[PDB]
């Protein structure tokens, strides 16, 4: 549990604390092993985990993210319980081994339900068909692979539930001998995570697991990485990053549009990043969480005229060919769509150099929640109406 | 001897417990005691279940039946729709002939409160808040002068009244319009006021009397469920004739009939009939 001397861990000291080299790790074996141990906990197992000496505000933050990790992990617990129940029910009705169940085709079902119907038993035929049909949608062992792995990473990140995973007294098969398991599957899995996924802190932020100050800084760390692997020379001067090339590659961190939007001088076109790729200019905006304050946030056409001809003055770029565009990302997290159109358009990356540079994008499936779908669609307001609505 | 609904004839190989009658296992007093208690509370549990199905409200039953009706095997994800279809529409009104303009809900940032109203409906006079000139005088309430507006506008046989707009006031209006004591009503999202349309029948009004519950704001009357239940009873006959309006802890404006239905007590506002 939490003791005097326990610290919340950063990414670098998590990479330092668990660093172990070993080759053979089943992601899907270990993930489920650790998962299983957490589902075996009772609620008191979450009790003492907050670190003893901290300023009170920071303590409140850690309480928040802990409670959200626990809520997510239980929310997944019951789901997995039901899933496993369905596997067990199929294996009972068919007589097939409980391992193979997940990989079956629909062909195999059309045959099996034919058997079961022709054996006169209708109830378990329909039962089997239901079980299989939902086991098809939610059944893959990788089903939510990324957010699970981020959960476990979060748990490492707190540097408290560490030793909760080992040292249990256990029974056996018909041997039924009582022994003490000294294997810590957690330490294994986290070591594996650090060794494989380098950027996983970036991911952990993209999924909204940073509840305070979230997903902004990790985006610019990400973009800066992307640019550094794209070009041959990168200077970082303060909040501005440039190329030594003589051709235009420029990344500007302008404002934080979260506070600077509600703080002072109510304005329209408040943005986050500016990126100049050569003849293309891109304003990258992170949507505000006020559905009221979004309608302004992306720039007025007059502002785009302005920025365009201002770049034309300064960089000497021809005003004939300039293409200035907007990209506005979801407020609290980052979906696949947004990252694809960040990789593909803003930076120009062909699929193979992206898959090279960012392996984890294939496994990363996150999509917009129903609540958050409409952040993109914005209220159209008339010019004689400007005194009423923002 | 053809049999319908009886499924395979003679069932399947099932003897009764008493008839088959395997030799009775002798349990230690422990086993027997535990059997008695678990099956006693099994019966208790069942009695509970049945009572709960008996007492289920009709709305609950309908939701249940049509929830099961649409149920599929996989819990399917919601489909992405148009930019939105789900904005609550603005209630229709005519711009040219108007008591007040119907103000958009899209302007919700512009609005003020009952105390400090935002400038709107300039072409119309603005109702003033009614406050005491001295100490001994009563402390008026939007409900008090809501009722007296309506009463006086009913005595002069007017079609429309402009009346103070607060939560429980337009609550009171919706309830009266439910019972049909009032032809109609509208809130234009004007800050100060909204409008009520009165109903007359056979030459006099539909409202005999309408009275506020309290004269002050400094006095607040609480209605026990048994009191609101007494009102409903005229010497053994059920009487819904007179309506009493009240607040709930839940901020709902209810008549006394729904209140008695769910057995909640509420704070009194006004009586009308």
């Amino acid at each position: 549990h939490a003791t005097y001397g326990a610290v919340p861990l950063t990414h670098s000291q998590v990479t330092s604390v668990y660093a172990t080299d070993g080759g053979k790790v089943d992601e899907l074996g270990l993930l489920e092993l650790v998962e299983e141990r957490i589902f075996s906990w009772k609620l008191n197992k979450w009790e003492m985990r907050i670190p003893p000496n901290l300023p009170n505000d920071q303590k409140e933050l850690i309480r928040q993210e802990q409670e959200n990790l626990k809520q997510i992990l239980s929310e997944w617990r019951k789901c997995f319980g039901a899933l496993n129940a369905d596997i067990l029910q199929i294996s009972s009705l068919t007589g097939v081994p409980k391992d193979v169940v997940r990989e079956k085709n629909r062909t195999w079902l059309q045959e099996e339900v034919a058997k079961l119907r022709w054996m006169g038993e209708v109830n378990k035929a329909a039962l089997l068909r239901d079980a299989f049909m939902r086991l098809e949608a939610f059944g893959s062992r990788d089903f939510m692979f990324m957010e699970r792995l981020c959960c476990i990473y979060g748990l490492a990140r707190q540097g408290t539930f560490d030793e909760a995973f080992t040292n249990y007294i256990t029974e056996d098969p018909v041997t039924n001998d009582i022994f003490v398991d000294e294997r810590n599957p957690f330490k294994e899995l986290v070591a594996h995570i650090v060794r494989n996924y380098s950027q996983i802190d970036i991911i952990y932020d993209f999924l909204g697991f940073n509840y305070s100050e979230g997903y902004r800084s990790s985006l610019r760390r990400y973009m800066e990485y992307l640019q550094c692997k794209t070009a041959e020379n990168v200077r970082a001067s303060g909040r501005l990053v440039t190329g030594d090339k003589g051709e235009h590659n420029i990344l500007f961190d302008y404002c934080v549009s979260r506070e600077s939007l509600v703080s002072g001088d109510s304005c329209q076109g408040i943005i986050d990043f500016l990126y100049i790729n050569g003849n293309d200019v891109t304003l990258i905006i992170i949507a505000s969480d006020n559905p009221w304050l979004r309608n302004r946030q992306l720039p007025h056409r007059r502002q785009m005229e302005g920025i365009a001809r201002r770049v034309c003055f300064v960089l000497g770029i021809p005003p004939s060919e300039v293409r200035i565009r907007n990209l506005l990302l979801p407020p609290t997290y980052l979906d696949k769509g947004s990252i694809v159109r960040l990789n593909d358009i803003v930076f120009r990356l062909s699929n193979e150099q992206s898959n090279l540079l960012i392996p984890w994008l294939t496994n990363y499936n996150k999509e917009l929640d129903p609540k958050d779908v409409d952040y993109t669609a914005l209220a159209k307001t008339t010019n004689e109406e400007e005194w009423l609505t923002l | 001897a053809k049999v319908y609904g009886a499924v395979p004839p003679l069932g399947a190989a099932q003897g009764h417990r008493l008839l088959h009658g395997k030799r009775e296992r002798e349990g230690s007093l422990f086993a027997v005691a535990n059997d008695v208690k678990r099956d006693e509370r099994l019966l208790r549990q069942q009695l509970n279940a049945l009572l709960e199905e008996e007492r289920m409200p009709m709305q609950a039953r309908l939701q249940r039946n049509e929830a099961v009706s649409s149920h599929e095997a996989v819990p399917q994800t919601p489909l992405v729709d148009l930019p939105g279809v789900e904005r609550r529409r603005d209630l229709p009104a005519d711009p040219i002939t108007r008591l007040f303009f119907q103000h958009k809900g899209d302007h919700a940032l512009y609005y003020g409160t009952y105390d400090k109203p935002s400038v709107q409906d300039d072409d119309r006079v603005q109702i003033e808040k009614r406050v005491p000139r001295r100490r001994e005088e009563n402390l008026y309430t939007p409900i008090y002068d809501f009722c007296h507006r309506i009463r006086e506008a009913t005595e002069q046989r007017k079609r429309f009244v402009v009346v103070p707009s607060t939560i429980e006031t337009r609550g009171c209006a919706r309830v009266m319009h439910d019972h049909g004591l009032v032809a109609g009503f509208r809130d234009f999202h004007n800050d100060r006021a909204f409008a009520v349309e009165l109903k007359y029948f056979q030459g006099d009004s539909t409202i005999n009397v309408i009275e506020p519950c309290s004269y002050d704001g400094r006095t607040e009357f609480e209605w026990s469920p048994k009191m609101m239940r007494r009102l409903l009873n005229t010497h053994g006959i059920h009487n819904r004739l007179v309506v009493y309006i009240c607040r709930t802890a839940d901020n709902r404006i209810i008549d006394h009939i729904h209140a008695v239905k769910e057995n909640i007590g509420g704070r009194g506002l006004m009586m009308v009939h």
């Binding site: 997940r102 990989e103 079956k104 085709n105 629909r106 062909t107 059309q110 098809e136 949608a137 893959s140 | 399917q76 994800t77 489909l79």
Partner: peptide
Amino acid sequence: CAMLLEKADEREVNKLLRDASRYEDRVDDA
């Protein structure tokens, strides 16, 4: 309804198709 020899592909193909048919079901409902 598309039956294949691969579980991943059967999975995502059938998810896609099912959603499509749901959309068409909304038009039909209209």
